[PDB]
Amino acid sequence: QEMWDSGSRSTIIPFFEQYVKKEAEVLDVGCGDGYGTYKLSRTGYKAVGVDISEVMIQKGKERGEGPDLSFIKGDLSSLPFENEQFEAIMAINSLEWTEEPLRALNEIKRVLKSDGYACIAILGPTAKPRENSYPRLYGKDVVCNTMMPWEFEQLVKEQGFKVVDGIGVYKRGVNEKMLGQLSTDLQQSLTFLWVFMLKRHK
Amino acid sequence: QEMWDSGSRSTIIPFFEQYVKKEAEVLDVGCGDGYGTYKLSRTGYKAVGVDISEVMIQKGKERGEGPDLSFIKGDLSSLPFENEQFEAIMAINSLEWTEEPLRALNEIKRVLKSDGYACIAILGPTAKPRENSYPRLYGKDVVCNTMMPWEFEQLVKEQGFKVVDGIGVYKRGVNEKMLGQLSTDLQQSLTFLWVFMLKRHK
Ligand SMILES: [K+]
Between residues 90 and 149 of chain A, which touch chain B (CB distance below 8 Å)? Predict the structure, then answer.
């Protein structure tokens, strides 16, 4: 709610709109409560939200399903969709919460139409949610993996994706002045999250 | 050589000198070729360098051992020294190159005199050497662990260390102006490495 309207995810859809033409079908991978999915439908896209949590899915369906908004329960590492079913995909901080990010990335690739866009956000190095990874230093199992924005960037390129753009969502204390002097990796280092705009290679 | 005279490690000893009184004995944990150890002796400390590589140790002994400079081959997770043998310790990027950073940190604590200082540097998130960690995304074993500066900071505090100061060694494109507006974690995010000044709790 707050995240999408004025929070850390409030600039994602406008960025998405810069590349993905309206009416294109979009799959929201790891949609959670489905508010982002809802926002996509409100912007003019036919959106489908997928998440492993039955509770989350029911939560999204309560928003009102229609010809432009639907939700499906599913495993992110085994998406219940056909190859190239979606013209576009959005995956906001879903890849950090798996022990097998490459497996999940390959599924995103599979269901995305060749030459289609994939908008994927990855948490910055100091983003608070990453504190979940800390216990690994004591030998404990953790849910949030340590794949950084720049590591994901390279991984996507090695998996058949072209990175065409990207924007940061910066933490308090950062200004546009200091940014326009830093290489991309350092800009990503100062973020709460980085939003990549990828394209599945044709 | 270049690293210590004008490179990424050229501001470490001056920082060390701000806290550790001369003549104090210092152990250089993971001394490598021992140039840093040599520099410590040149600054006025009685330095001992320890490293697992027999080749590296012989390399350091070639610099000329004396009453203020010596080298010993040893396992960083099983230091061949007595409890509280050293009044001060320096560990420059040695903790990132082990699969068990906590084990190594506890050994550093053990050989350091209570209330003594430990100068420890940790690579920043985008430091090039961390590319060694990348293959883990393909399920491969890697030498460089992913423990970040801020994670180490918390780990040291939970292990009986007080963090009293710290300085960054920044990558090209960063200026002091933008820094004085960022919280410590973001300053660390923009570094090639962060140098912590710790004290073993009494
Ligand atoms: K890791």
Answer: 101-102, 124-126, 133-134, 137-138, 146-148
Q: Which of A90, A70, A85, A76 is nearest to A16 (CA)?
A: A90
**B-interface mutation test, from A186, A187, A192, most B Cβ less than 10 A away:** A186
Under the phi-then-psi rule, with left for phi > 0, alpha for psi from -120 to 50, and beta for the rest, what region is A44?
left
- Using a CB-CB cut-off of 8 Å, the residues of chain A touching B177 are 178
CA B198 to centroid of ligand 1, rounded, Å: 25
Count of Cβ atoms closer than 10 Å to residue B35 Cβ = 20
Answer for the pair B107, B76: CB distance below 8 angstroms, yes or no: yes
Handedness of CA B82, B86, B87, B89 (dihedral sign): negative
Tokens standing for residue A66: 């229609």
Q: Please state, in angstroms and rounded to a whole number, the distance separating the CA atoms of residues A78 and A139.
A: 28
Q: How many angstroms separate the CA atoms of B48 and B42, rounded?
A: 13
Contact B124 A175 (CB under 8 A): no
Task: Give the sign of the dihedral formed by CA B164, CA A134, CA A147, CA B178.
Answer: negative
Residues 6+ apart with CB under 8 A from A154: B134
- Which technique was used to obtain these atomic coordinates? X-ray
- Which parts of chain A fold into alpha helices (H)? 2-5, 12-19, 35-42, 54-61, 101-111, 149-158, 176-179, 184-189
DSSP designation for A144: S
Rounded to the nearest angstrom, the distance between the alpha carbon of B96 and the centre of ligand 1 is 11
Secondary structure (3-state) at B1: coil
- Return d(Cα B28, Cα B32) in angstroms, integer: 9
Beta bridge partners of A90: A28, A119
Q: What angle do CA B97, B102, B105 make, to 5 degrees?
A: 80
Task: Burial-class residue A59 by CB neighbours within 10 Å (0-12, 13-18, 19+).
Answer: middle
What is the bridge-based pairing of β-strands A69-73 and B69-73?
Answer: unpaired
CATH no., domain A1-202: 3.40.50.150
Resolution in A: 1.7
Closest-CA distance, B34 to chain A, in angstroms, reads 29
